[PDB]
C-alpha cells in the first residue's frame, strides 16, 4: 500500500523552473525521509536530495545552489523546486521512501519525465494500422497502432482499456524534427478480428488528449 | 619478587631510574658515614634531603611500575593515571623544596666542598640520561625537572661557597637561594599546569582546537539532528577519551552514522570514543 | 565523491544457471564491519527495485535467487538460477558518502533458442494519406537474437535514407525482441510506386523473410 | 567587602567555622612564634600541622566556590573535581610537612639544641585547651588531632622536671607518625578518585547491572564498561552493547539506562553496535 | 507482568463513523519518550494482522484511517471512518517488560440497516439414510442484528433436546449473520414423524418465517 | 512475499511431546528473529518465546522448563519444541516474524491448530444438503454439505475446487459427544443448479482424508 505519486510538468522551458509534487500513501512522513533521484540516458542514476522527517534537506553538492525541497505532513506531500534548468536536465524524476535504518530506497514512485525545451506541446496523431487486403490471414493476426508527431514524452497506448495485454508490443519512440514517432502492435485470434471490436488508447497527458481510435479493416 | 626486577631491566625508564635508585643509596651509605666522621654540622641535614630525593625517584619509578600494569574490575581503565599522579606530586615536592632552599637561605638571611662535587656529577649523569625528558612523558617530565631543580640548587651553594671564599662577600647566598627557588618554580609551574589539567577531566588542549570542526562533521552527516553531552578528556599521555550523544532520524541508519563518527572523531585522535544513538520521536 | 564501475556493461547468460554482476568502488564503502552498498533491478519501463542492501541483506519479497556478497571495494550480485523475468538492468549504489552514487548499470540478457521473427507489414492509412503523410510500417515480433537486418525494397529498389528503426526490450516471458521499421513518405512518392516490399534478414535461416504489398 | 562582614556575622553555623579559622591560624602564628623563638621543633610540627589543617577546611570553601563555577568547552565537566584535588594536595603537603619535621626531629636527636626556654612554658595546655574547644564546640581526623597535642604535653613535662633533651624529638617524630596515619585515609580515597577507579559504592552493584542488561532481549554481549567518580555521589558511566541485526535499540538503550539508574550511575553513555549475524 | 485491560470488550459502530478502543496497562510501557505498545487486528479465521507499533505509528501496508495515541499507560486505537471491513477484534500487545503480554480484545461490530434471514431447511440425505441417523439442518443467511431464536416443531409440536446451533462471524462485506441449526435423530423418530418445519423468529418482522417439508 | 508456513501435529497425547516447525519464506533467519505466540479461546493470546539470529532464545518464565525453541539457517526452518502438554495447552500456534528494530511481530503464519485429548482421529463423514423435490425454485437455490463425525479441528470445506466463492457461508464446529460436527452453506443462481456440476470438497489433514462428495438433485 506503500505508494508514491509524482505530478509535475512534462515540459519546461530553458533557464525555467521545475516543481515536482510527490504524494505519499502507506506511510507517514513524520518518520520517514523520502530521496529525490533522477535517471537520464546520459548521466544515469543522479541522487539529487533528500528531505527528513523534522524538515531537514541534504542536496547533492553539484545542485546544492538550486535545489530546493520541501514537505507538509498533513496532507503527506514532498515538494521538489529546481531552478535554472538547461538541456542537460531531461530526466526521469523519481522520489522514493528511504528503506528504514539503511542507506537503501525500499519504495519507489513511477517517476515524471521532465523535457528541457523550447518547444511547444504537440498533440498525438493516431493512424490505424491494418493488414493489407486479407492475405495471409492464417490464425495470429497483428493489429498496429502508429503514434506520430506528439511532443514531449509520454504517451501511453492501450488496447480497449488495458484488457488485452498479452500480445502487446509498444515500440521506443523516435525524436526526429523535434516530433516523437511511436509505433504499437497487437496480436488476437483471427476468430477476435474483425468479428469483436478492438481499439488502441492513446492518451498524451503532456496536452491532456485522449483519443480512442477504431481499428477497421480496409 | 624475582620477576619484579626482571620487568624493572626490561623497561627502559625503570632501569635508568633503579641505576639513580642505586646510585643514589650507594652515596647515601657513602655521605653517612662521612657524616658520622665527625663532622655533623650540616651534612645530616643534606644526608636527609637527598634521601629525600631518593624517594621522589622511588616514587617515579614506582609510578612506572605501577602504570605497567593491567587493568581489572576496580581499575578498568587501568593503572595509568600513575604517571600523572607521579607528575603532580613531583611538582608538589618541588614546590615544597623551593620552599626548603627559602628556608637555608633564611637560616643566614640578614646576620668540605667534597660531597657536593659528588652531587654535582650524579647530577650532570642526571642531565646526560634524562635528556628526553623535556608514561616517559609524564614521569621523565617530573624526575627531569627534580633532577634539574637539585642540580642548579647545588650550583648555587657551590656559587656561594665560592664567592665567599674568592671575593668575600656575605650576602650572595640568601639571593642566590631566593634567585634558586624562584628559577625552579618557574620551571615546574607548566607540568603542574598540565597534570592539573589532566586530574579535572579538562578538555584535551591537542585536542581542543579540532573539536569544533569535528562536531560539524558530525553535525553534517546525513540525518543527524543535534549533538548533546559531548565530553572529552585525557586518561594518560596521548590517550584521549570521548563521549557523546547523538539525536538522529527516526529511520536514521545508525550504522553508518555510528561508524562516520567513529572515524571522525579518530582522525581527530580519539582513542576511545562512545557515541550513543538516541533516535527523534519527529 | 565515490565512483562505483560496473563489470560487464552487458551480461548474456543462459536459462537456469548463475550470473555475476560485479562493482568496483573508487574509495572504500566499509564501516566498522559494515559494507554500504546497495543492489537495485530495474526492468523497462520501471522505477528501480532495491534487491539487496548493506551488500549481502535480501531486501523482504524479493526472491532467494538473488545474493550479495563481497566487501571493502569489490561487491558481486549473483542470480542463481536466472530466470526470464530477470530480464532487466542491475545497479549498484552506495551510501558510504555523500552524494549518495550510482553504478553505471549492467544489462541482463537472458539467453535462448534462435526464433523467426514474425514479419508484418501495413500500408499507410487513409487518414495518413489525408493528412498528407505517408508511412509503411513493418512489425518483426518475437524474435531471437537481438541482431537483425531490415531492408526495404520499392518496387524492387531498396530505399535507405527514410527509414527509422526502434527496437524494444528483452520480454520477461519469452525473452525475445520485437523490431518496427518505418517507410515515413510523402503522397506523391507514395502514390509514383507500387510494389512496397519488407525484408528481415536474420541468423536462424539464410533465406530472408519476405512481406510486401501493392498499390 | 562591606556585605561580606555583615553577613558572616549575623549567621550561625558559618559563624563558628569562621571562629574555627581565626582563631586556630591565630594560636598557630603564637605557637609558631614561640617555637622559633626557643627550641620547640615539636611546637613548630603542631603548629604546621594545625595550621595545615586551617588550610584544609578553607581550600575546601575557596574549592567550593570554584566548583559552583559553570563549564566551559574546555572544561566539560565544570570544575568539580577542585575538591578532590584540593583534599589530594593539603593530604601531600600535610605528608611533607611530617617527613621533613621528621628529618629534623632525627638531626636534633643526634645532637640537642639544649636551649629549653621558658617564659610562657604552659603555652601546651593552651594547644590542648584550644583544639578541645575546636574539635568538640565547633565541627580518623576527628580524633587525630587531639592525640597531636599530647605529644607537645609530654615534652613540657619532661623540658621542666628533668630537662630530659631525647623528650623534644621523640614527640617531633611521633606527632610526624600521627600526621601521615591521620592523613591516609583521605589520600586513598583522593587517590581512588583521581585514578578513574570504579566507585566503591557502584563495585558491588555492577555484576548485577551487567547481568540485568545481558538478560535484555536481542542483546549479545556487553563490552568495554567502564564507570568512574567524577565528584561526591556523581558516577559517569560508559558501555558498548552488540545486539542483534534486527533488535530494538530504544527499548535496549531505555532499559540499559533505567538498570544503571537504579544502581546510582548518573552519567550514563550506552554504544548500541548491531551486529552482522 | 504487566497486565493489558481493554475497554469496552465489545463496541458497535456503524458505517463512517469514529470508532475508539482503550487500552490500561498496569505498569507504564513508556521508555524516554517511546511507549512500547503495539495495535494488531485479528479477523475471523484469520493471523494477527499489525496495525500500529509503539503507539503512534502507522505500519506500512495499513489504511490510514488507522490512527495511535496515548502514553505512559493509557493508549487509544481510533478508527476514522469505520468500513465494513474493519469487523475484527483488536489487541494491543505491550514490549516494555519481559514476557510480552497482550490485551484481553475488543470485538468491533458494524452497525447497519436490520436485514430478514434468507432460510433454507433441509432433510437428512440418503447416504446419512444408509448412515444409521437423520439429522435436519436450517441455514438463516445474512440477517441483522445477530440476535435470532429458532423453534423446531415436529409434526406441530415443540421439539428442543437435540437442538445444536452455530454461529457464523459477522460477514466483511455486507456486515451480516449466518445461524445454521441441525437436529441429531435416530430412524425411529425420524420415520415416525412426518412433517417437519423451521420456524425462527427475528426483530426485523413480527411473524415467524416457517420452512417446511414433509417425509 | 514473506511467508511463514507451521507444520506441527493436529492431534497431541497428554504428557507428551510437542514438535511445530515454522519454515520462513522471504526474509533470512540470519537477520530476523521469530517469536512464537499461541492463542486460545479461554487464556487469549500469550507470547511463548523468541530465538534470535544469533541462536539466543527467551521464553516466557511460565514456559521456561519444558519449551525449548530451536532453528537451522540453512533450511530456513524454526523448530518448535514443548514438553509435557496438558489439556490447556490446547491452542493454535503462530510463528511470527519480529518486525526489524521494534518489539512488535509483523508477519504471522496462518497457525497450527493443536489439541491435547486421548481420543483418537477420526475421518469425517460428508453428507449432502438438497432442498427437498423442487419446492420453491425461485432465482437463489442454497446448498448444504454437512461434515459429521470428525476429530480433531480443523477440515477445510470448499466449493467447486475454489471457483464458487461467493455466497459461501462455512459454520464453526460443535463439539458434541467427544466429535466435531460442522456444515457449509452457498448459494448458486436456479439456472445454474443442476445445471453444471456442484461438488463438495472436504479436506481432514488429521486424518489424510480428501472427499469431493457431488450435490444432486432430491
Ligand atoms: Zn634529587
Ligand atoms: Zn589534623
Redesign the pocket.
Given at each position: 500500500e506503500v505508494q508514491l505519486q509524482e505530478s509535475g510538468p512534462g515540459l519546461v522551458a530553458p533557464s525555467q523552473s521545475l516543481s515536482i509534487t510527490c504524494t505519499v500513501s502507506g506511510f507517514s512522513l513524520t518518520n520517514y525521509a523520502v530521496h529525490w533521484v533522477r535517471q537520464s540516458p546520459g548521466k544515469g542514476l543522479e541522487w539529487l536530495g533528500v528531505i527528513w522527517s523534522n524538515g531537514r534537506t541534504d542536496y547533492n553538492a553539484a545542485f546544492i545552489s538550486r535545489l530546493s525541497i520541501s514537505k507538509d505532513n498533513s496532507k503527506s506531500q514532498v515538494f521538489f523546486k529546481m531552478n535554472s534548468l538547461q538541456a542537460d536536465d531531461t530526466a526521469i524524476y523519481y522520489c522514493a521512501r528511504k528503506l528504514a535504518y539503511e542507506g537503501a530506497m525500499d519504495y519507489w514512485g513511477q517517476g515524471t519525465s521532465v523535457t528541457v525545451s523550447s518547444a511547444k506541446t504537440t498533440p498525438p496523431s493516431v493512424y490505424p494500422l491494418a493488414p493489407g487486403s486479407a492475405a495471409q490471414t492464417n490464425s495470429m493476426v497483428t493489429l498496429g497502432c502508429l503514434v506520430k508527431g506528439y511532443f514531449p514524452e509520454p504517451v501511453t497506448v492501450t488496447w480497449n482499456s488495458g484488457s488485452l495485454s498479452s500480445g502487446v508490443h509498444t515500440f521506443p519512440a523516435v525524436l526526429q524534427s523535434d516530433l516523437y514517432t511511436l509505433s504499437s502492435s497487437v496480436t488476437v485470434p483471427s476468430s477476435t478480428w474483425p468479428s469483436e471490436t478492438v481499439t488502441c488508447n492513446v492518451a498524451h497527458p503532456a496536452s491532456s488528449t485522449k483519443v480512442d481510435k477504431k481499428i477497421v479493416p480496409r | 619478587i624475582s620477576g619484579w626486577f626482571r620487568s624493572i631491566l626490561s623497561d627502559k625508564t625503570s632501569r635508568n631510574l633503579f641505576f639513580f635508585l642505586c646510585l643514589n643509596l650507594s652515596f647515601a651509605f657513602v655521605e653517612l658515614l662521612y657524616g658520622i666522621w665527625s663532622n655533623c654540622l650540616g651534612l645530616i641535614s643534606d644526608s636527609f634531603h637527598?634521601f629525600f630525593?631518593?624517594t621522589?625517584?622511588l616514587a617515579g619509578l614506582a609510578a612506572s611500575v605501577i602504570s605497567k600494569w593491567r587493568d581489572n574490575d576496580a581499575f578498568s581503565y587501568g593503572y595509568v593515571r600513575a604517571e600523572v599522579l607521579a607528575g603532580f606530586v613531583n611538582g608538589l615536592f618541588l614546590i615544597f623544596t623551593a620552599f626548603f632552599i627559602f628556608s637555608e637561605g633564611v637560616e643566614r638571611a640578614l646576620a668540605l666542598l667534597l660531597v657536593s662535587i659528588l652531587g654535582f656529577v650524579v647530577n650532570l649523569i642526571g642531565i646526560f640520561v634524562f635528556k628526553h625528558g623535556g608514561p616517559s612523558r609524564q614521569i621523565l617530565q617530573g624526575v627531569f625537572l627534580?633532577?634539574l631543580a637539585?642540580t642548579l640548587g647545588s650550583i648555587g651553594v657551590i656559587a656561594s661557597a665560592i664567592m665567599m671564599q674568592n671575593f668575600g662577600l656575605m650576602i650572595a647566598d640568601p639571593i642566590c637561594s631566593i634567585l634558586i627557588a624562584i628559577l625552579i618554580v618557574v620551571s615546574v609551574i607548566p607540568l603542574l599546569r598540565e597534570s592539573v589539567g589532566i586530574l579535572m577531566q579538562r578538555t584535551p588542549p591537542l585536542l581542543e582546537n579540532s573539536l569544533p570542526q569535528c562536531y560539524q562533521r558530525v553535525q553534517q552527516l546525513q540525518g543527524v539532528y543535534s549533538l548533546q553531552e559531548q565530553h572529552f578528556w585525557t586518561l594518560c599521555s596521548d590517550v584521549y577519551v570521548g563521549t557523546l550523544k547523538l539525536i538522529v532520524a527516526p529511520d536514521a541508519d545508525a550504522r553508518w552514522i555510528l561508524s562516520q563518527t567513529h572515524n571522525i572523531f579518530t582522525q581527530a585522535g580519539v582513542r576511545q570514543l562512545y557515541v550513543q544513538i538516541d533516535f527523534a520521536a519527529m | 565523491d565515490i565512483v562505483l564501475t560496473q563489470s560487464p556493461a552487458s551480461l548474456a547468460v543462459s536459462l537456469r544457471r548463475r550470473a555475476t554482476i560485479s562493482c568496483r568502488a573508487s574509495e572504500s564503502v566499509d564501516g566498522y564491519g559494515h559494507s554500504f552498498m546497495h543492489w537495485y533491478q530495474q526492468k523497462s519501463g520501471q522505477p528501480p527495485k532495491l534487491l539487496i542492501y548493506r551488500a549481502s541483506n535480501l531486501e523482504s519479497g524479493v526472491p532467494a535467487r538473488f545474493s550479495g556478497s563481497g566487501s571493502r571495494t569489490d561487491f558481486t550480485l549473483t542470480i542463481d538460477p536466472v530466470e526470464a523475468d530477470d530480464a532487466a538492468t542491475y545497479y549498484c549504489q552506495q551510501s558510504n558518502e555523500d552524494p549518495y552514487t550510482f553504478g553505471s548499470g549492467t544489462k541482463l540478457e537472458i539467453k535462448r533458442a534462435d526464433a523467426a521473427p514474425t514479419v508484418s507489414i501495413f500500408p499507410p492509412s487513409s487518414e495518413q494519406l489525408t493528412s498528407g503523410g505517408a508511412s509503411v510500417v513493418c512489425f518483426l515480433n518475437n524474435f531471437y537474437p537481438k541482431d537483425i537486418n531490415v531492408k526495404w525494397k520499392i518496387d524492387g529498389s531498396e530505399r535507405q535514407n527514410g527509414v527509422l528503426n526502434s527496437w524494444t526490450d528483452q520480454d520477461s516471458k519469452d525473452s525475445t525482441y520485437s523490431m518496427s521499421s518505418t517507410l515515413t513518405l510523402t503522397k506523391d512518392e507514395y502514390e509514383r510506386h507500387n510494389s512496397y516490399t519488407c525484408e528481415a534478414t536474420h541468423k536462424t535461416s539464410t533465406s530472408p523473410i519476405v512481406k510486401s504489398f501493392n498499390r
Open positions: - | 637527598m630525593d631518593s621522589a625517584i627534580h633532577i637539585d | -
